[PDB]
Amino acid sequence: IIVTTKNGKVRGMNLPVLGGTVTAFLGIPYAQPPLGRLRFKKPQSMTKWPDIWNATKYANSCYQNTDQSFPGFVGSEMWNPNTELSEDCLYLNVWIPAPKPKNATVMIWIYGGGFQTGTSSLHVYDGKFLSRVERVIVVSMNYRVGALGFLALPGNPEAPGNMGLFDQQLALQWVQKNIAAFGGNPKSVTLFGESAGAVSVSLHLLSPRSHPLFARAILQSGSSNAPWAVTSLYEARNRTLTLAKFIGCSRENETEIIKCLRNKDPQEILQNEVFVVPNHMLLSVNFGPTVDGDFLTDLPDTLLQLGQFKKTQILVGVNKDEGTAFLVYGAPGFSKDNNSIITRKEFEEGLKIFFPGVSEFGKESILFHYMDWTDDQRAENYRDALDDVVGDYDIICPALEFTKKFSEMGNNAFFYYFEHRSSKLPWPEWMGVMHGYEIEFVFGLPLERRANYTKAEEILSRSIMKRWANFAKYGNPNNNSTRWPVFKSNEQKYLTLNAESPRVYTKLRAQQCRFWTLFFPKV
Ligand SMILES: *[C@@H]1O[C@H](CO[C@@H]2O[C@@H](C)[C@@H](O)[C@@H](O)[C@@H]2O)[C@@H](O[C@@H]2O[C@H](CO)[C@@H](O[C@@H]3O[C@H](CO)[C@@H](O)[C@H](O[C@H]4O[C@H](CO)[C@@H](O)[C@H](O)[C@@H]4O)[C@@H]3O)[C@H](O)[C@H]2NC(C)=O)[C@H](O)[C@H]1NC(C)=O
Ligand SMILES: *[C@@H]1O[C@H](CO[C@@H]2O[C@@H](C)[C@@H](O)[C@@H](O)[C@@H]2O)[C@@H](O)[C@H](O)[C@H]1NC(C)=O
Ligand SMILES: *[C@@H]1O[C@H](CO)[C@@H](O)[C@H](O)[C@H]1NC(C)=O
Ligand SMILES: *[C@@H]1O[C@H](CO)[C@@H](O)[C@H](O)[C@H]1NC(C)=O
Ligand SMILES: *[C@@H]1O[C@H](CO)[C@@H](O)[C@H](O)[C@H]1NC(C)=O
């Protein structure tokens, strides 16, 4: 099962997948480990090995703080790393169908986690079913997160910033130089990711040196024009100097502030990593993408206006209840153990968490347009509205504006609206169709009948996998099934995804997105 790469031979394995076989290569090194003097630096090219590399096991996950908000709760711990943590984490995984193809489409997955957490070895990112059913090749890599991946000093090569984004770009280059040996076409590469991974995919669309590294893009619950996606260059410097203060590496020679951090323990860096931002949450990307002038030369909104992006097809979409997962981690009155009926005082305190710098009249504008504009006097009125406030502002409306921008320029786009709640979802009912729970349907986990999903969930997962692979192969997700129309700038049609009957509507959340883009900036 041995495949020869440009750096050496790799040894894989055969997996029983749905009455067939999928060949897996887990842990192929694609970059020199960023240890010692290489910490905070851009990734270096991988060295050559003369032997056989046993890529038969998930490699290490990058250092990251783990979620401990709900101890022993499977709904939150399923996202925590499931391999040993280590700075030596730059590895990728490949899934090849059986029998071996000759020019298969390659889909490369980029995980999320607010640019502070995440690994490619999670069970919900297992790409064996996708390669088995749709006969594509699936690739996924680990990239540095947190300060170890996004510590930024402007123009300083010791810590230039966006290093985790360069980790992804180097893994993309590995697929160009090597995927033909495994049976994949380097000209049919589609990037797909969720949340911060969707921000990463949409940042490769705005980085010219990544354009020749892929063909198409899929954005799941995220886009680089979201308010939490990118910080300014001076903002990232403020946060590096803040981390140095807490950890005790504050110097007036900047280039030697990095030599001090390079001698701190990674666990020590993670502990002071949280004090950098005024309030640590999921959307408080303390060390994430910045306008570094190298990987990213301008704010994503500016680049979209100037048409400075890869002209190609994109497949974007969001989930029905995007904000609930974020409210349970910070907003007062929200709990996973009760229905979270919040009061008006708790609503206004939730706005203060997710809108830290806006005035009291600005909060009164959000409150009027989401509550007092309608007669909704139900007991869940404030709870559901705060879900829509965070969902529209941070995920849904930015993703719709990104899709609109690709459409104005004349590129074909396809927008979805995921509406299905997993029967195995461990979170309570009030959270609904949560952020991050379309991924198991994209990766075909309900196809294992021993996983005890409903029969309709296996059908829905096969439908979503089919549309995802069709878009990667032919640039169009579409036959006698319900046709998925092209998102045009004028009509703005989208397709809902659910286990009953997919439907086509127009102008998703139009009234709310018009408030965030046309009126709220003026208050
Ligand atoms: C849904 O659940 C949330 C979360 O509550 C916590 O989890 C639940 C699963 C359950 O175990 C709860 O007991 C647990 O607290 C609820 O929101 C919390 O509500 C409590 C009160 O019910 C708040 O704590 C109080 O806050 C005040 C200011 O600090 C203060 O008055 C209280 O202290 C005083 O009272 C206690 C007696 O409770 C006494 O021991 C003290 O000495 C003092 O006198 C108390 O600390 C939490 O802050 C709330 N959490 C938030 C806002 O995040 C929520 O009410 C619940 N909703 C429904 C509809 O059931
Ligand atoms: C690499 O693996 C060789 C063969 O191991 C067998 O096949 C692989 C695919 C796995 O299924 C494994 O569990 C099997 O035992 C070993 O002979 C060889 O020693 C390994 N190389 C190193 C460096 O450990
Ligand atoms: C694979 O497809 C590309 C175009 O997409 C073509 O140039 C190439 O010759 C094909 N076959 C291979 C690499 O065997
Ligand atoms: C970061 O910015 C704040 C905003 O005013 C400023 O007060 C603070 O001194 C800065 N921190 C630094 C430069 O470490
Ligand atoms: C699934 O449901 C069946 C119902 O008979 C049960 O036997 C089984 O233990 C459940 N769980 C799994 C993981 O198969």
XYZ file of C-alpha atoms and ligand atoms in Angstrom:
649
model
C 0.000 0.000 0.000
C 3.122 2.137 -0.238
C 3.067 5.474 -2.079
C 6.217 7.433 -2.930
C 6.147 11.193 -2.358
C 8.713 13.815 -3.306
C 10.264 13.485 0.171
C 9.953 9.733 0.733
C 7.666 6.745 0.859
C 4.580 6.667 3.083
C 2.734 3.599 4.369
C -1.057 3.640 4.642
C -3.817 1.196 5.583
C -7.099 -0.262 4.351
C -10.305 0.536 6.223
C -13.614 -1.374 6.083
C -16.095 1.344 5.078
C -19.730 0.513 4.249
C -19.151 -2.931 2.789
C -16.146 -1.665 0.817
C -12.667 -0.295 1.411
C -11.029 3.118 1.785
C -7.260 3.591 1.841
C -6.087 6.011 4.540
C -2.781 7.818 5.093
C -2.890 9.455 8.538
C -0.038 11.690 9.647
C 1.962 12.577 6.526
C 4.380 15.368 7.529
C 4.090 18.366 5.206
C 6.336 20.866 7.019
C 9.385 21.004 9.247
C 8.218 20.970 12.897
C 8.141 24.535 14.308
C 10.365 23.864 17.323
C 12.904 26.118 19.043
C 13.980 28.970 16.793
C 11.143 28.059 14.405
C 8.401 28.805 16.960
C 6.249 31.769 15.813
C 7.966 31.596 12.398
C 6.402 30.724 9.065
C 6.449 26.978 8.300
C 9.589 25.607 6.657
C 9.707 23.010 3.898
C 9.694 19.363 4.949
C 12.974 17.457 4.889
C 13.532 14.142 3.128
C 13.474 10.778 4.880
C 15.169 7.662 3.451
C 12.890 5.061 5.055
C 9.143 4.292 5.054
C 6.930 6.660 7.053
C 4.146 4.745 8.824
C 1.173 7.050 8.232
C -1.096 4.615 10.068
C -2.226 6.816 12.974
C -3.500 10.333 13.593
C -0.524 12.568 14.370
C -0.290 15.082 17.203
C -2.656 18.002 17.675
C -1.298 21.517 18.032
C -1.144 23.056 21.497
C -4.483 24.576 22.475
C -6.607 25.301 25.518
C -9.326 22.671 25.874
C -12.997 23.360 26.540
C -13.866 22.678 30.191
C -17.083 24.702 30.453
C -19.239 21.561 30.823
C -17.209 18.779 32.460
C -18.024 15.308 31.174
C -20.589 16.639 28.668
C -20.207 15.004 25.250
C -21.682 17.949 23.332
C -18.743 20.198 24.229
C -15.953 17.630 24.623
C -16.483 16.173 21.136
C -14.644 19.265 19.866
C -11.621 18.855 22.175
C -8.426 17.301 20.761
C -8.306 13.501 20.680
C -4.543 13.035 20.241
C -1.507 14.121 22.231
C -0.793 17.850 22.248
C 2.601 18.924 20.901
C 4.203 21.770 18.974
C 5.207 19.101 16.434
C 1.766 18.943 14.830
C 2.132 19.942 11.146
C 0.735 16.811 9.495
C -2.022 15.954 7.027
C -4.331 13.022 6.269
C -5.448 11.588 2.923
C -8.363 9.274 2.072
C -8.328 7.441 -1.279
C -11.243 5.370 -2.633
C -10.913 1.681 -3.422
C -10.149 0.731 -6.153
C -7.627 3.523 -6.700
C -8.898 6.325 -8.981
C -6.829 8.071 -11.641
C -8.062 11.686 -11.754
C -10.318 12.047 -8.722
C -11.509 15.382 -7.368
C -9.779 16.379 -4.117
C -11.674 18.108 -1.294
C -9.458 19.676 1.387
C -11.079 20.292 4.776
C -10.039 23.085 7.150
C -11.418 22.767 10.680
C -12.626 25.643 12.821
C -12.401 26.585 16.466
C -12.084 30.363 16.552
C -8.433 30.091 15.464
C -7.734 29.016 19.066
C -8.758 25.330 19.054
C -9.329 22.431 16.689
C -7.688 19.390 15.119
C -8.169 17.282 12.000
C -8.418 14.004 13.954
C -11.904 14.643 15.377
C -14.427 11.914 14.630
C -16.778 14.386 12.902
C -14.023 15.177 10.359
C -13.455 11.530 9.367
C -13.321 11.567 5.581
C -13.604 7.843 4.908
C -17.344 7.899 4.182
C -17.078 10.836 1.779
C -14.303 9.117 -0.174
C -16.264 5.841 -0.152
C -19.623 7.166 -1.311
C -18.662 10.000 -3.655
C -15.316 8.506 -4.769
C -13.360 11.701 -4.151
C -10.043 12.097 -2.327
C -10.291 13.858 1.045
C -7.396 15.793 2.608
C -7.205 17.540 5.992
C -4.281 19.148 7.831
C -3.403 20.489 11.263
C -2.440 24.159 11.512
C -1.140 26.105 14.495
C -3.760 27.978 16.533
C -3.667 30.487 19.383
C -0.611 32.634 19.966
C 1.623 29.837 18.639
C -0.171 30.207 15.304
C -1.119 33.884 15.119
C 1.225 35.913 17.342
C 1.999 38.985 15.249
C 4.687 41.642 15.298
C 4.413 43.858 12.186
C 7.108 43.014 9.654
C 9.079 40.937 12.171
C 10.036 37.559 10.615
C 10.576 36.147 14.104
C 6.784 36.386 14.560
C 5.158 37.785 11.428
C 1.558 36.746 12.087
C -0.865 34.539 10.144
C 1.544 31.630 10.614
C -1.334 29.165 10.957
C -2.726 30.425 7.654
C 0.668 29.788 6.047
C 0.539 26.285 7.553
C -2.625 25.696 5.510
C -1.041 27.192 2.380
C 1.949 24.863 2.697
C -0.384 21.884 3.019
C -2.110 23.103 -0.144
C 1.277 23.112 -1.892
C 1.872 19.547 -0.691
C -1.344 18.467 -2.425
C -0.183 20.067 -5.680
C 3.255 18.420 -5.550
C 2.039 14.987 -4.413
C -1.674 14.195 -4.843
C -1.155 12.765 -8.336
C 0.776 9.849 -6.803
C -2.269 8.884 -4.717
C -4.645 9.115 -7.690
C -5.961 12.667 -7.436
C -6.191 15.504 -9.942
C -4.349 18.605 -8.647
C -6.503 20.711 -11.000
C -9.789 19.663 -9.345
C -9.188 20.790 -5.746
C -12.022 22.226 -3.649
C -11.505 23.805 -0.219
C -14.259 23.423 2.372
C -14.338 24.392 6.038
C -16.600 25.462 8.870
C -16.608 28.628 10.980
C -12.951 29.620 11.402
C -12.146 27.046 8.727
C -14.658 28.785 6.463
C -12.916 32.057 7.276
C -9.659 30.363 6.295
C -11.066 29.107 2.988
C -12.431 32.575 2.239
C -9.040 34.103 3.116
C -7.267 31.842 0.621
C -9.742 33.339 -1.854
C -8.301 36.760 -0.914
C -4.621 35.716 -0.973
C -3.172 35.691 -4.518
C -0.409 33.176 -3.763
C -3.098 30.629 -2.772
C -5.125 31.077 -5.976
C -3.099 28.533 -8.032
C -3.423 26.025 -5.190
C -7.151 25.234 -5.531
C -10.112 25.500 -7.911
C -13.297 26.018 -5.848
C -14.422 26.905 -2.327
C -17.173 25.975 0.150
C -17.944 28.210 3.159
C -19.910 26.596 6.012
C -21.096 29.049 8.698
C -18.310 31.544 8.154
C -16.751 34.163 5.907
C -13.673 36.356 6.236
C -15.763 39.558 6.233
C -17.404 38.561 9.542
C -16.837 41.117 12.348
C -14.676 38.641 14.306
C -12.565 37.369 11.405
C -9.581 39.719 11.003
C -7.857 42.213 13.293
C -5.801 45.185 12.188
C -2.012 45.079 12.219
C -1.817 47.533 15.124
C -4.455 45.512 16.986
C -2.424 42.304 16.718
C 0.647 44.165 18.000
C -1.291 45.422 21.035
C -2.202 41.819 21.872
C 1.336 40.469 21.476
C 2.634 43.160 23.837
C -0.202 42.336 26.245
C 0.707 38.636 26.251
C 4.345 39.542 26.909
C 3.278 41.610 29.921
C 1.331 38.791 31.593
C 3.904 36.084 30.805
C 6.818 38.281 31.882
C 8.620 38.701 28.539
C 8.163 42.480 28.206
C 11.257 44.096 26.673
C 12.001 47.276 24.748
C 13.929 45.275 22.114
C 11.038 43.739 20.175
C 13.110 41.114 18.348
C 14.259 39.791 21.746
C 10.743 39.726 23.186
C 10.426 36.739 20.848
C 13.578 35.029 22.123
C 12.014 35.237 25.595
C 8.710 33.736 24.428
C 10.581 30.989 22.561
C 12.013 29.865 25.918
C 8.652 29.797 27.704
C 6.684 26.591 27.969
C 3.757 26.138 25.551
C 1.482 25.436 28.513
C 2.732 28.696 30.030
C 1.864 30.587 26.834
C -1.648 29.111 26.771
C -2.298 30.213 30.361
C -1.552 33.888 29.704
C -3.201 33.642 26.273
C -6.641 34.133 27.837
C -5.868 37.434 29.610
C -5.030 39.099 26.281
C -8.644 39.968 25.400
C -11.051 41.715 27.818
C -13.431 38.718 27.743
C -12.549 35.216 26.543
C -15.330 33.553 24.537
C -15.665 31.659 21.251
C -15.821 34.740 18.986
C -13.085 36.589 20.906
C -10.321 35.529 18.527
C -7.466 36.662 20.775
C -4.726 35.587 18.344
C -6.122 35.153 14.850
C -5.824 36.483 11.308
C -4.500 40.010 10.865
C -3.751 42.402 8.010
C -0.079 41.364 7.958
C 0.702 42.778 4.502
C 2.030 39.362 3.441
C -0.737 36.754 3.432
C -3.444 39.438 3.711
C -2.767 42.901 2.302
C -6.048 44.615 3.245
C -9.246 44.084 5.197
C -11.479 41.466 3.514
C -14.249 44.044 3.014
C -11.905 46.368 1.110
C -10.566 43.549 -1.074
C -14.094 42.415 -1.923
C -15.033 45.958 -2.979
C -12.004 46.205 -5.296
C -12.736 42.768 -6.803
C -9.320 41.567 -5.645
C -10.235 37.923 -5.168
C -10.039 34.628 -7.031
C -12.875 34.556 -9.576
C -14.425 31.097 -9.151
C -17.515 29.270 -7.938
C -18.334 29.195 -4.214
C -20.889 27.246 -2.172
C -21.859 29.129 0.996
C -24.443 28.468 3.678
C -25.453 28.804 7.316
C -27.499 26.941 9.916
C -30.923 27.985 11.149
C -29.971 28.657 14.803
C -26.426 29.995 14.541
C -26.245 32.020 17.764
C -27.459 29.532 20.379
C -24.126 27.731 20.755
C -22.423 31.060 21.499
C -24.992 32.254 24.054
C -24.607 29.192 26.296
C -20.902 30.077 26.738
C -21.199 33.643 28.047
C -24.564 35.383 27.937
C -26.328 35.678 31.321
C -29.344 33.449 31.834
C -28.401 30.768 29.287
C -27.822 27.189 30.431
C -27.745 23.777 28.782
C -29.773 22.401 31.722
C -32.857 24.630 31.427
C -34.874 26.281 28.679
C -32.959 29.566 29.242
C -35.937 31.927 29.452
C -34.049 35.208 29.800
C -35.308 38.630 30.864
C -34.921 42.004 29.182
C -32.099 42.870 31.593
C -30.270 39.691 30.571
C -30.936 40.495 26.907
C -29.321 43.928 27.241
C -26.411 42.310 29.085
C -26.024 39.863 26.208
C -25.754 42.768 23.781
C -23.007 44.221 25.968
C -21.010 40.996 25.597
C -21.310 40.639 21.805
C -21.201 44.413 21.089
C -18.478 45.678 23.427
C -17.904 49.144 21.980
C -21.335 50.322 20.809
C -23.290 53.022 22.633
C -26.428 52.718 24.752
C -28.527 54.089 21.896
C -26.965 51.504 19.592
C -28.136 48.739 21.911
C -31.571 50.380 21.982
C -31.551 50.152 18.171
C -30.858 46.411 18.212
C -33.493 45.934 20.906
C -36.140 47.849 18.952
C -35.547 46.092 15.632
C -35.438 42.611 17.171
C -38.137 42.963 19.839
C -40.280 46.092 19.901
C -40.823 46.094 16.110
C -43.062 43.000 16.462
C -45.809 41.890 18.865
C -44.021 38.690 19.987
C -45.062 38.397 23.643
C -44.132 34.728 24.076
C -42.001 33.693 27.039
C -39.131 32.797 24.661
C -39.160 36.183 22.899
C -35.928 37.584 24.370
C -34.146 34.228 24.162
C -34.944 33.622 20.491
C -34.232 37.238 19.532
C -30.763 37.133 21.095
C -30.137 33.993 19.038
C -31.080 35.943 15.912
C -29.023 38.998 16.936
C -25.763 37.065 17.266
C -26.601 34.693 14.415
C -27.393 37.464 11.940
C -24.582 39.812 12.963
C -21.653 37.386 13.237
C -22.464 34.532 10.821
C -25.492 34.818 8.553
C -25.483 38.365 7.168
C -21.690 38.506 6.571
C -21.912 35.188 4.707
C -24.733 36.596 2.566
C -22.765 39.771 1.801
C -19.735 37.695 0.810
C -21.875 35.608 -1.548
C -23.440 38.758 -2.994
C -19.972 40.174 -3.729
C -18.904 37.082 -5.670
C -22.229 37.349 -7.534
C -21.911 41.016 -8.528
C -18.633 40.149 -10.272
C -20.330 37.373 -12.256
C -19.150 34.201 -10.506
C -21.689 31.448 -9.902
C -22.565 30.889 -6.242
C -24.898 28.545 -4.363
C -26.334 29.330 -0.919
C -27.903 26.875 1.538
C -29.887 27.144 4.784
C -29.441 24.072 6.981
C -32.610 23.326 8.971
C -32.204 19.772 10.325
C -31.598 19.061 14.012
C -29.741 15.813 14.658
C -31.746 13.195 16.542
C -28.543 12.467 18.512
C -27.885 16.113 19.422
C -26.920 16.181 23.133
C -27.679 19.895 23.582
C -31.168 20.922 24.800
C -34.124 21.716 22.552
C -33.963 25.501 22.902
C -30.646 25.593 21.030
C -32.259 24.117 17.907
C -30.176 23.673 14.757
C -26.810 24.590 16.220
C -23.570 25.965 14.845
C -21.311 23.063 13.915
C -23.896 20.276 13.606
C -24.199 20.129 9.839
C -20.660 18.690 9.672
C -21.610 15.120 10.596
C -24.060 15.166 7.669
C -21.419 16.579 5.310
C -18.970 13.825 6.366
C -21.549 11.037 6.157
C -21.615 9.865 9.770
C -25.369 8.982 9.611
C -24.516 6.386 6.946
C -23.244 4.026 9.650
C -26.465 2.333 10.735
C -24.705 1.279 13.944
C -24.479 5.000 14.783
C -28.284 4.938 15.288
C -29.312 7.903 13.183
C -32.768 7.856 11.640
C -33.256 6.508 8.131
C -34.145 9.985 6.865
C -30.881 11.303 8.322
C -28.927 8.793 6.244
C -30.856 9.979 3.184
C -30.218 13.628 4.067
C -26.508 12.958 4.598
C -26.237 11.178 1.238
C -28.007 14.144 -0.380
C -25.668 16.709 1.195
C -22.596 14.615 0.368
C -23.815 14.317 -3.227
C -24.315 18.073 -3.644
C -20.969 18.808 -1.968
C -19.083 16.457 -4.289
C -20.996 17.577 -7.391
C -19.930 21.159 -6.689
C -16.318 20.026 -6.227
C -16.301 18.003 -9.469
C -18.448 20.075 -11.845
C -18.815 23.442 -10.123
C -22.550 22.887 -9.695
C -24.192 21.006 -6.792
C -26.858 19.444 -9.065
C -31.616 14.753 -12.137
C -35.134 14.611 -10.658
C -34.247 16.014 -7.227
C -35.139 19.575 -6.258
C -32.898 21.834 -8.309
C -30.495 24.107 -6.447
C -30.661 27.482 -8.251
C -27.720 29.811 -8.748
C -27.510 32.676 -6.262
C -27.878 35.787 -8.433
C -27.377 39.291 -7.064
C -30.906 40.291 -8.076
C -33.159 37.409 -7.001
C -30.865 35.906 -4.302
C -32.377 32.416 -4.258
C -31.203 29.882 -1.686
C -32.045 26.258 -0.899
C -33.081 24.905 2.487
C -31.636 21.569 3.613
C -33.841 19.280 5.699
C -34.895 15.651 5.924
C -38.406 16.313 4.584
C -38.474 18.497 1.461
C -35.819 21.035 0.404
C -37.370 24.356 -0.607
C -36.222 27.426 -2.539
C -36.718 30.888 -1.030
C -35.285 34.345 -1.722
C -33.478 37.018 0.308
C -32.575 35.165 3.487
C -32.986 37.341 6.600
C -33.308 40.316 4.251
C -34.895 42.709 6.752
C -32.304 41.945 9.439
C -29.268 42.152 7.158
C -30.519 45.472 5.794
C -30.535 46.717 9.400
C -26.948 45.645 10.098
C -25.502 47.038 6.861
C -27.597 50.166 6.190
C -28.767 51.574 9.536
C -26.828 50.161 12.492
C -23.471 51.663 11.320
C -25.021 55.149 11.545
C -26.278 54.915 15.146
C -31.050 28.505 33.988
O -29.799 28.234 34.584
C -28.956 29.362 34.757
C -27.623 28.855 35.260
O -27.806 28.554 36.625
C -26.890 27.538 37.086
O -27.053 26.325 36.391
C -28.308 25.658 36.515
C -28.211 24.397 35.683
C -28.669 25.390 37.980
O -27.824 24.450 38.597
C -28.572 26.704 38.754
O -28.797 26.542 40.133
C -27.183 27.315 38.575
O -27.051 28.546 39.236
C -29.621 30.368 35.712
O -28.912 31.587 35.821
C -28.289 31.741 37.119
O -29.192 32.116 38.135
C -28.600 32.183 39.422
C -29.726 32.327 40.424
O -30.736 31.393 40.130
C -27.535 33.297 39.454
O -26.782 33.327 40.651
C -27.188 34.407 41.532
O -26.672 35.662 41.128
C -26.871 36.825 41.930
C -25.770 37.848 41.632
O -24.509 37.226 41.748
C -27.132 36.593 43.433
O -28.409 37.091 43.805
C -27.115 35.127 43.939
O -26.359 34.926 45.113
C -27.260 35.005 46.249
O -28.133 33.893 46.274
C -27.570 32.610 46.505
C -28.707 31.610 46.486
O -28.886 31.147 45.170
C -26.821 32.596 47.841
O -26.153 31.370 48.053
C -25.769 33.700 47.825
O -25.095 33.813 49.058
C -26.419 35.051 47.538
O -27.279 35.445 48.584
C -26.658 34.058 42.916
O -25.265 33.904 42.839
C -26.527 33.046 38.333
O -25.618 34.105 38.187
C -27.240 32.851 36.997
N -26.322 32.541 35.935
C -26.081 33.345 34.883
C -26.842 34.650 34.881
O -25.301 33.063 33.986
C -31.000 30.734 35.172
O -31.724 31.521 36.080
C -31.830 29.490 34.870
N -33.062 29.850 34.221
C -34.239 29.212 34.372
C -35.387 29.783 33.574
O -34.387 28.238 35.093
C 5.301 0.142 9.876
O 4.331 -0.876 9.757
C 4.841 -2.156 9.432
C 3.672 -3.079 9.166
O 2.758 -2.974 10.234
C 1.512 -3.613 9.881
O 0.846 -2.913 8.857
C 0.444 -1.575 9.146
C -0.208 -1.024 7.894
C -0.465 -1.522 10.377
O -1.702 -2.158 10.168
C 0.248 -2.215 11.539
O -0.532 -2.298 12.708
C 0.627 -3.637 11.135
O 1.310 -4.324 12.152
C 5.751 -2.632 10.568
O 6.336 -3.883 10.285
C 6.880 -1.625 10.754
O 7.677 -1.927 11.868
C 6.320 -0.222 10.967
N 7.392 0.736 11.004
C 7.840 1.332 12.123
C 8.976 2.303 11.916
O 7.379 1.115 13.234
C -6.772 15.018 -15.188
O -7.531 16.150 -15.557
C -6.783 17.262 -16.025
C -7.736 18.411 -16.284
O -8.641 18.564 -15.216
C -5.963 16.876 -17.267
O -5.103 17.911 -17.696
C -5.102 15.658 -16.960
O -4.429 15.192 -18.098
C -6.004 14.537 -16.431
N -5.368 13.243 -16.246
C -4.328 12.795 -15.496
C -3.551 13.747 -14.613
O -4.004 11.619 -15.529
C -3.609 48.387 23.904
O -4.595 49.348 23.601
C -5.212 49.990 24.696
C -6.378 50.789 24.149
O -6.340 52.122 24.602
C -4.144 50.799 25.442
O -4.640 51.439 26.597
C -3.054 49.839 25.908
O -1.990 50.527 26.514
C -2.488 49.005 24.755
N -1.638 47.965 25.275
C -0.326 47.807 25.011
C 0.278 48.833 24.082
O 0.346 46.901 25.484
C -28.866 1.409 18.651
O -30.181 0.946 18.856
C -30.287 -0.460 18.978
C -31.762 -0.802 19.044
O -31.940 -2.196 19.111
C -29.472 -0.952 20.187
O -29.373 -2.359 20.227
C -28.045 -0.406 20.140
O -27.340 -0.669 21.325
C -28.050 1.106 19.916
N -26.714 1.651 19.858
C -25.732 1.343 18.985
C -24.447 2.104 19.207
O -25.834 0.526 18.081
